[PDB]
Symmetry: D2
Subunit: 480 residues, 4 copies
Amino acid sequence: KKLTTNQGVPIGDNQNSRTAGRRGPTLLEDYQLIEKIAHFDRERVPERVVHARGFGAHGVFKVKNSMKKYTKAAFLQEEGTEVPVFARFSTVIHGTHSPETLRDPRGFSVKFYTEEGNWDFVGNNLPVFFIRDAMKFPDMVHSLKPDPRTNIQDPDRYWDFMTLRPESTNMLMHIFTDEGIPASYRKMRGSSVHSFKWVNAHGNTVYIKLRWVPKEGVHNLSADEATEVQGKDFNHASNDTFQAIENGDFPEWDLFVQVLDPADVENFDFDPLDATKDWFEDVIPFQHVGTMTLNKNVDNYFAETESVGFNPGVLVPGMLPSEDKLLQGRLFSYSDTQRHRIGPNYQQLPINCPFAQVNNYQRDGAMPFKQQTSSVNYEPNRYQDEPKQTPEYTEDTQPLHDDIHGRLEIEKTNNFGQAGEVYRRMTEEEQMALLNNLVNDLQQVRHENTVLLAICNFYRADASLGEKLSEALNVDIKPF
Amino acid sequence: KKLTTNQGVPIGDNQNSRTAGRRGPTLLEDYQLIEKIAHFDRERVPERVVHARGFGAHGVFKVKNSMKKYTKAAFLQEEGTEVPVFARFSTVIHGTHSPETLRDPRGFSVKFYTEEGNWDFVGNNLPVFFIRDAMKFPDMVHSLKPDPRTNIQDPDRYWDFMTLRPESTNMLMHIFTDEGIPASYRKMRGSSVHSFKWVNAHGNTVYIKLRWVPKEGVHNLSADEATEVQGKDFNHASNDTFQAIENGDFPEWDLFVQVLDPADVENFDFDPLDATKDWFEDVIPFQHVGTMTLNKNVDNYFAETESVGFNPGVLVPGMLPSEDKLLQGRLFSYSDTQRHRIGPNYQQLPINCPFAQVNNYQRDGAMPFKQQTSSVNYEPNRYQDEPKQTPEYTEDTQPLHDDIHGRLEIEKTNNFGQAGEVYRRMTEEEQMALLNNLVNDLQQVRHENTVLLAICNFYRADASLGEKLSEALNVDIKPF
Amino acid sequence: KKLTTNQGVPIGDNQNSRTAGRRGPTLLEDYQLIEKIAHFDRERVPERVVHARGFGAHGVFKVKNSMKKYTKAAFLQEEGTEVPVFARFSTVIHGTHSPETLRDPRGFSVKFYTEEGNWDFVGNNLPVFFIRDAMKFPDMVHSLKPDPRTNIQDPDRYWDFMTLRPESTNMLMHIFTDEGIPASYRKMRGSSVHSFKWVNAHGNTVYIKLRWVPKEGVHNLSADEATEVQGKDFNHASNDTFQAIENGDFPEWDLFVQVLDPADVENFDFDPLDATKDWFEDVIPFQHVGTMTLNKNVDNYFAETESVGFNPGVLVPGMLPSEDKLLQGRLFSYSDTQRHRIGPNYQQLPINCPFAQVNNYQRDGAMPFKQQTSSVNYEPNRYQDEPKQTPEYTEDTQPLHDDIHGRLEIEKTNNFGQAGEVYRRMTEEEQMALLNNLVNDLQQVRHENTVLLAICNFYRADASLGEKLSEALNVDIKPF
Amino acid sequence: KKLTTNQGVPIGDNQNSRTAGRRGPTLLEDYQLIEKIAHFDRERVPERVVHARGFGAHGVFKVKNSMKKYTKAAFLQEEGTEVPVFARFSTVIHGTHSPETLRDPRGFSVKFYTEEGNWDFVGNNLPVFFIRDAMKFPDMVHSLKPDPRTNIQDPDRYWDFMTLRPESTNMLMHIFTDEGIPASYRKMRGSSVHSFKWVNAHGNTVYIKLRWVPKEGVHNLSADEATEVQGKDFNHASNDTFQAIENGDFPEWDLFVQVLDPADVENFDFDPLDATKDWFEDVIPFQHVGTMTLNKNVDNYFAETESVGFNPGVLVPGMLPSEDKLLQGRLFSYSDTQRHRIGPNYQQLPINCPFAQVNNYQRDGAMPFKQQTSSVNYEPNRYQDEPKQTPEYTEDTQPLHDDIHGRLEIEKTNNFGQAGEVYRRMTEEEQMALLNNLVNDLQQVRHENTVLLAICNFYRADASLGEKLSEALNVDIKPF
Ligand code: HEM
Ligand code: HEM
């Protein structure tokens, strides 16, 4: 195999620059060097705005139970159907090469290359979020991100944002358990967090939540375990998940679905479209869908794991987004950031390409590798053999329930009630882990009012938790 | 054929946005709409900084005569060998959709997809150039480019540069004949302008110049003729050349080489490596090489004619650049601008991709469509099966003739002598044309000193042309 | 002034590259050369996807009549207030350096640097548009743009689209008069085309349309006149408007507003919010607002006219978009394309920069010249003196009138009615010019049933015009 | 202070998206939301290809001793002259948010904002490099970078490359002492590694090396110490250096220079221009130049530390690059990558901007914030007030010493000899640490031939090291 330039010219000497004499300066005419150095200079692209640290693998999804009752999604009609998937697991706040032992939700992303298009599942392990409207997401992230001067994450900064956005209480309850540091990607669950809509063949729509349950079980690290691991291996989760697949101990998860009829949405003490809210298995049963097996590592990380883009509003027919106000901003954000991060034709890259043929009138854009060449780039047109709309594929109408449009916060926020229930649903071990992690984190806040507000927010959720935090801190909340 | 999103989801309704009601505001969840518009939003890329305006087509090069004597270049070894080519012809100064009736050199670019890699011929119709050092190219372009306030080309600006850089005189002789406006791309010659080095299997090197000769002959347009054409068709040359191919009237050119022994370089009243100097056919004979035939229009202009990059420094084994100081900056410039204009991985696109297989240790970069998957991305390595250098392909050594490096103008400039020779080689018809065009261009110069300088420069070249310019302008030339 | 590199190093020799000898190859260590070339290599950015060709100038808006009864827009409160403006005028379909003699609507864009933010008016001269839903815009553009193979605009393609999308009929009536070729940018009107919403201090909203009247009158070119101009000057309108300002003949326009109560939207034979429909002066009267004077040319085309971004959705308090399905896509499109075309931080460039101060929690992005330095990059936050929201500026609620969202075409299409009205409002001159231009255009269509359809669409609008086109073409229309 | 959009419009509600009803879907017309999310989507830019993990601060350089004897560099003429500096320290191989406890050279970069332009010092702590020609850098970096499939650094890969490129031996001797892991940025030295050239007022040139000596002393961490620190703090060095400055304990370094007359270069058992070679203090004395004090943290990491670009070939008059083949490729590469990573106009950003004024003929390029507005954008020109060249600043000619140019490896490679002396110059504790670290590293190599090669490479430098490695490994080297 001959070494070549990008021009296919064979290289004779890959060790020496062309110089003006044996010990003289380098020549501008060294095309081979400059081509090599110039490409090297251009290897890097922007990391993900969040969830930059991650691990991806290939596998298959296998449907066990037909879902035709709830959705007319092609792949979900018949038990036994298998769909290729690519998955990516990730942390959130810190960058590429950041340790995998930090406290963070863990991203859980699955691209399904379906016969009717790509569907992206893009969730986290943790079943709720800090906030309920996309308007706040840059703020939340900016608050959690390293301090913009010091480049170091500072709890004084994020506890500020969080205390003043008290809907974050419930998420705080989850993230400061030991479930805030999974032991690895293969030992964690997945959650859609948002409701979506599934519509069946007759146009009945239900609200659905999605649920991944690992065959290896949920396994977490305590703070001291995380520190121990960090010192030895800053790539532990990636390492462990890569080795398991390479050794043939294939990571597997089961997919379950929760179904809530639209006519029942007022029936709870919470808005079911609020992303700060969970649907307890107790109140809404999990129904088995199928199982994902990841059985093949990437061939190349950059081209596969780094270059994939997912979007929760990338859905197949039979699937629609919910009105969830946090989800609604995501629909835009993901693809929007990918046009910048990966490129305008990012959907043409092997890792992003659908299994279904792409036939449309879109054209051009930088690096047009899979340019459709028909000169007929407009629709409607006169030609019968060019791509046409298939009316049966139109997304059905959905209901509107208000007489006004504008900036209108939902009515039943219930910022503390469900958070309290989540606390009381925990075992003693979980409640003690939560207290020690919260205390350790609040000891790092440098503004008293923020600490007071944090303890107060927790107190409203559960009085005894708030009392314990008060004692450990030691800040008396009694006057308030 | 089903119409689809870039995700492979069949589109039901390609005519209506999803709105909050039949006469309501558009929804951010309209993924189909946003994908479509966002891609549309990104269709465009930067135009070529020069030669933006152009036309491309595919064809074949047939070598008629073996070049073994002069070069070891594989495709040139045997009579009858055929190489696929892609050619682009161009104006220079104005942008995309610029009239093709403007006075400019015309670009003549040919990519040869060779058994030993790509070779780009990148020349103009005209046999010489305005300057002799790349250092001056941005200045020269900026002077000819539309005034940066008015956005209209102004003779007052570029005559300023050209008079103050007297080496331009020779090019001014050519450019202001009627050969400044070719009738069509098919009715023009091609010139390498610079000499290059060819090296044979034995290791002898010769200076060479390359030459394209139109089967349809050289045909030009007077000013008034160009004005007539321009009013009815601003894409006239692209239109003619497109139609010619489609009608089966394939444009052909014969290629010729001029050969100069490096030992004979100081035997002239000019420096043969000076880009402002021609190699007259009567001094160095044209030797036939073969013939190019353009026999297929692009399937798609954007992915072919817009997205192609050429570099005079993209050479196959057997070829090397000369030390011509204008050429030497071009070796860098072209591939550098393509990395910007087209993208880091521009050599991966089909129009740029070699016929010879590419095998190397380069990786990543934006849109890594053709990523090499082997994890061995470093050389030297322990693996016999990975790409290896092939020493017999090592570019040969070349003489150094000085004991200092630095910023050092050539001795024999001869800024006016050959410019004179060229004029006295013209027919009386061409000399009248030169005068009419010169006068009509010099009439637009608002600084009398620039006008005087032009006149002196032409005078030093040929005293009769000088006095004629003076008489017509009318500024007598007895003082200075 | 000493000539310097971008590093601030004074340059000794700007004429010669650094070479390995007087006649030797160029050195890679020539930083000065490489910096200069590499920057030249990067001068170009993408041109606008539409309206690439254009001219900009600075000026002033003077408000003459208070608009307080209709809007609480600060700058519109007091008769006498001046706002600085930047305006850009353009053709539509072809690229940079394309003739300004071509048949095209003309862009009319004005940035108002107001005390309460930038307001961008982004209209055309013609008062209607070809289509009424943004979903169709890429298709409409693609059909009108050069054929993706020949690189020449083809009536056979765009008629194909326009006939198949018969809502276009009204716009064809307009664009095929002589008004399709304005004599220049100063000699044309401007239209909002869409209605917008103005909201007052008491919270009443009205539908509004905006209207620019030239002090110079509306002046147009016939096909033959445009053809004669084109031969001589392809920059004719830019040239005219530039010179006019230097000469002190300041291009001026009066601004007029047409008002409509949301209560009266059903009292017409058309949907007021349909972009294919005009609001006739004699049905909704023009009310005078103020005058714009353009009194200063750009210092630099690139940094001003090239680099400016407008968006019709960039509105000041007191203004809101209507539900016009074409407008609603524009809200997204413009800013979207600018982030790609100009850059993520395009709003930080002087030409785009507001007069009002920018204070928020956004950060970073490529080329962050005006980066906000405060480490408090999140809101809410504990700091009294960091930026805070001002609730009285909250865009107020707007009625919703449907109980479903979805892909739902409007009721009163009236694709031909008002198109006929328009034709019958024309003088005999205009009707003659329309006939000539249409026939000349329809003679270039190569497909029978497209021509037939065009004549039928025009016939449905007006029987006599239908007959005359039928007569001239010449197909009898007795059957169908 | 009012919260505003990038348009300067006051925001009233920064908490709620505009939605089609209180519990309905989000509106495309929420300009405020989309501007916000869309800028957030674009915050990230590519990290540095190498040395992505870093820390920057401002300060001052004070010249203690005139250097006029050796250079005519303006800032170095007079004792007591003070120049502003920005410094950045960094690791090498891993990405942003990588631990600072990893084994790697440590980058030491200093930008001097001089009265005659910017000078960049761009060195490492360690005084030699792994390779001696730029041709090999991508390969070396690829071998050291995470395996492109596992995303984990693998000694089996980098030992492959290193053993097969035995010139690396000397650097291995350095990097595998505990100096492979400095305790922080303020407790490490700096080295130019390369010689450069200094030219005085008379045109005499000497070769110089540059040396930074920390007031705080050189302090390192053993492997176990590094492990302990890593578990607790992955930002330790950034943390420590930022706190020192913030507490008023300013990091200081003394700058020293070593001088070698060009007439003495043949006098050593090594080529003094080989970047794998050190110039021992006892062979060429260090001469005090001045001191750097870092006294001011950044206001903003992104705009300062992230967006700064340095290039060792960015030199002031009085300074020139040496013909060092490693240094030669760096002259091109730094500015090349920055054009991509930061932007074509990267030199216009506050952190990169010279102290000295920038006056030249370059124009345009993306985000032209500091566009020079003069319409005279070409040189030579007629105007005496426009930027002119200053011939006294012309870079002096330098010697050439060969009669050929081509790919020509230096003759006295001495790959093992100096490496031997470096080992023999070590203390016994340094020698034990070296052995422990090498053994720990070579136990992770999985190919016997590479371990044997490594051991043989060390043996050739020093027999007792070769034996100690052989015994500890346990690999028999006797048969060879
Ligand atoms: C009544 C309908 C329309 C009018 C009057 C109009 C007018 C204009 C004008 C005047 C410009 C040039 C602005 C400038 O000088 O910078 C422009 C550019 C543009 N238009 Fe529109 N247009 C219309 C419809 C649309 C639609 C439906 C879309 C797609 C949703 C669209 C997308 C664009 C884009 C992407 C640009 C490029 C802007 C830039 O690069 O900054 N236009 N249009
Ligand atoms: C002994 C030789 C070398 C030393 C001492 C060295 C040191 C450094 C340092 C300290 C930085 C970080 C600058 C900063 O803080 O921004 C850096 C970055 C970099 N280096 Fe070198 N390096 C060496 C060799 C090379 C070579 C041979 C090349 C290839 C031609 C190279 C290419 C690069 C590139 C492309 C960057 C990224 C710069 C940017 O994005 O701004 N280095 N190096």
